[PDB]
C-alpha cells in the first residue's frame, strides 16, 4: 500500500501568513491512464473532512482562491495564502491511484503561533472522600502553556511511577492560543500510604530544568 | 449532497455493529466509501460499494470483518463491522465518491456495562487559585460538567474524556481570584444520564 508522508505534522502560523504543507508518496501517483489521483481534504475542529483540492490542483465547489495545490508524481504541496481562522484544522492528502486501499497522509494540524508560555502547574492530593474508597488519585494540571509539546513524569518518594497514569490534553485555546494538560496518577489507597512525597514533573521548551510541583502526603 | 449517519454505538470486544448512512440530494451514481478516523486523527479507508450493482472492494485489513451493503428503496448504505476490539473505538465515516462526507458514527468497544462515576472535589494543597474536579470511572460517554451550575464559565479547562481499562475518566480545572475562593462557594456539578448520576461536589479547603 502507498505510504503518504506529510510534513510538517504541526504547522503554527500567524494570521495572514502563507502556509505550505508537503505530501510525498512512497511511489508515483501518476496512473497508467494519465491521471494523478491526489486530493486534499480539510477537517475543521469538530467537523467532518471536506474536499478542498482534487486531482492535484483543481479547487472543489466553493473553495477559496487562497488554496492551491501543486506538484507531480511523488511530491505534492498545498499552499494556503492569507491564513484566517476558518482555515485552522487538519489537512490530509489522499491517493486513489494504487487501490485498494485508498491511503491518506497522517494529517497536518494548522495551528496558531504565539509567544512561549510556561505552564501553570497545580497538584492535587486525593480527596478525603476518595481515600474512604481504597483508591487514591493524584491530579496535576499543567495549564495555559506554549508550545504544545510537553512531557510529564510522576515521581513518588523520588522514584518514577509509570503505571496508573491517565493523561488528557486540550486543543489549542481559541482565545489565547495556549494548550493545557491533565495528568492523573491512580494508586490503591495502600500503595498511596506507603509513600510520602508526590511530585508532578514536566519538561517543556520554557525551561532547561524540570518544572515541578509537589506535596507531602501528611 | 447530505449524508446522515446513525448515532453512537457501544459494544463488547468480539461483537459486531451495524451502522447506517442515509443519503439525500443520485444515490446510484457514486460508490459509497467508508473511512475510519482513529484517535490521533489518522484515516484508514475500509472499502466501498457500488449501489446499483452491489460490487464491493475492501482494504485487505478489513476484508473478512466488514461487510458493506445498500438499500436502494431508501438510499441508505450500511456497514457491518465484526470482530470488534479496542482498536476499533473510533469514528466511522461514509463518503459519497470520496467527495462528500457524513458526520461520522462513533463506535466504542469496552468490556464494561454502564458504570456510574465517582466524582471528587480537588482543593488546593494544605492572588489566583486553581480548583479541580475529577470524574472517575464511568461508561459510556457523555458526562456534563459545570461549575456553579454554569455561572462560573471563564477560567475553566474541562479535559476530553479518556477511555482506559474499559472506563472513562474526565477532569476539569477552574481558576479564580483569591478574593473569590474560599470566601464564595465553588461547586462542580456532574451529570451522567446513562447511569442516572447527578452529583454536586463543593470544593472545600482541606
Amino acid at each position: 500500500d502507498v505510504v503518504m508522508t506529510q510534513t510538517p505534522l504541526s504547522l503554527p502560523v500567524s494570521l495572514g501568513d502563507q502556509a505550505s504543507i508537503s505530501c510525498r508518496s512512497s511511489q508515483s501517483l501518476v496512473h497508467r491512464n494519465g491521471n494523478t489521483y491526489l486530493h486534499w481534504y480539510l477537517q475543521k475542529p469538530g467537523q467532518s473532512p471536506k474536499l478542498l483540492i482534487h486531482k492535484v490542483s483543481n479547487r472543489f465547489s466553493g473553495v477559496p482562491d487562497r488554496f492551491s495545490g501543486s506538484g507531480s508524481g511523488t511530491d505534492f504541496t498545498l499552499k494556503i495564502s492569507r491564513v484566517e481562522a476558518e482555515d485552522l484544522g487538519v489537512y490530509f492528502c489522499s491517493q486513489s491511484t494504487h487501490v485498494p486501499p485508498l491511503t491518506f497522509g497522517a494529517g497536518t494540524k494548522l495551528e496558531l503561533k504565539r509567544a512561549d508560555a510556561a505552564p501553570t502547574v497545580s497538584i492535587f492530593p486525593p480527596s478525603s472522600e476518595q481515600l474512604t474508597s481504597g483508591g487514591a488519585s493524584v491530579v496535576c494540571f499543567l495549564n495555559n502553556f506554549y508550545p504544545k509539546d510537553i512531557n510529564v513524569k510522576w515521581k513518588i518518594d523520588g522514584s518514577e511511577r509509570q503505571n496508573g497514569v491517565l493523561n488528557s490534553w486540550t486543543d489549542q485555546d481559541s482565545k489565547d492560543s495556549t494548550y493545557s494538560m491533565s495528568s492523573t496518577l491512580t494508586l490503591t489507597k495502600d500503595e498511596y500510604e506507603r509513600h510520602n512525597s508526590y511530585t508532578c514533573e514536566a519538561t517543556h521548551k520554557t525551561s532547561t530544568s524540570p518544572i515541578v510541583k509537589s506535596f507531602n502526603r501528611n | 449532497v447530505q449524508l446522515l449517519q446513525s448515532g453512537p454505538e457501544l459494544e463488547k470486544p468480539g461483537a459486531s455493529v451495524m451502522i447506517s448512512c442515509k443519503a439525500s440530494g443520485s444515490f446510484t451514481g457514486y460508490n459509497m466509501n467508508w473511512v475510519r478516523q482513529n484517535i490521533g486523527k489518522s484515516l484508514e479507508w475500509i472499502g466501498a460499494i457500488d449501489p446499483y450493482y452491489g460490487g464491493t472492494s475492501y482494504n485487505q485489513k478489513f476484508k473478512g470483518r466488514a461487510t458493506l451493503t445498500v438499500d436502494k428503496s431508501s438510499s441508505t448504505a450500511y456497514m457491518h463491522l465484526k470482530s470488534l476490539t479496542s482498536e476499533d473505538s473510533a469514528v466511522y465515516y461514509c463518503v459519497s465518491g470520496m467527495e462528500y462526507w457524513g458526520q461520522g458514527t462513533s463506535v466504542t468497544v469496552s468490556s464494561a456495562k454502564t458504570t456510574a462515576p465517582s466524582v471528587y472535589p480537588l482543593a488546593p494543597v494544605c492572588s489566583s487559585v486553581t480548583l479541580g474536579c475529577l470524574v472517575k470511572g464511568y461508561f459510556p460517554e457523555p458526562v456534563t460538567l459545570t461549575w456553579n451550575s454554569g455561572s462560573l464559565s471563564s477560567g475553566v479547562h474541562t479535559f476530553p474524556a479518556v477511555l482506559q481499562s474499559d472506563l472513562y475518566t474526565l477532569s476539569s480545572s477552574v481558576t479564580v481570584t483569591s478574593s473569590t475562593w474560599p470566601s464564595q462557594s465553588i461547586t462542580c456539578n456532574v451529570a451522567h444520564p446513562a447511569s442516572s448520576t447527578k452529583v454536586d461536589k463543593k470544593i472545600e479547603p482541606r
Binding site: 489521483y37 486513489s96 487501490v99 | 466501498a48 460490487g55 472492494s57 465518491g97
Partner: peptide, 11 residues
C-alpha cells in the same frame, strides 16, 4: 461505478 476521484475503484 467510475467516479472521478477514485479512478479504477469499482471501475
Amino acid at each position: 461505478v467510475c467516479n472521478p476521484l477514485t479512478g479504477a475503484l469499482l471501475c
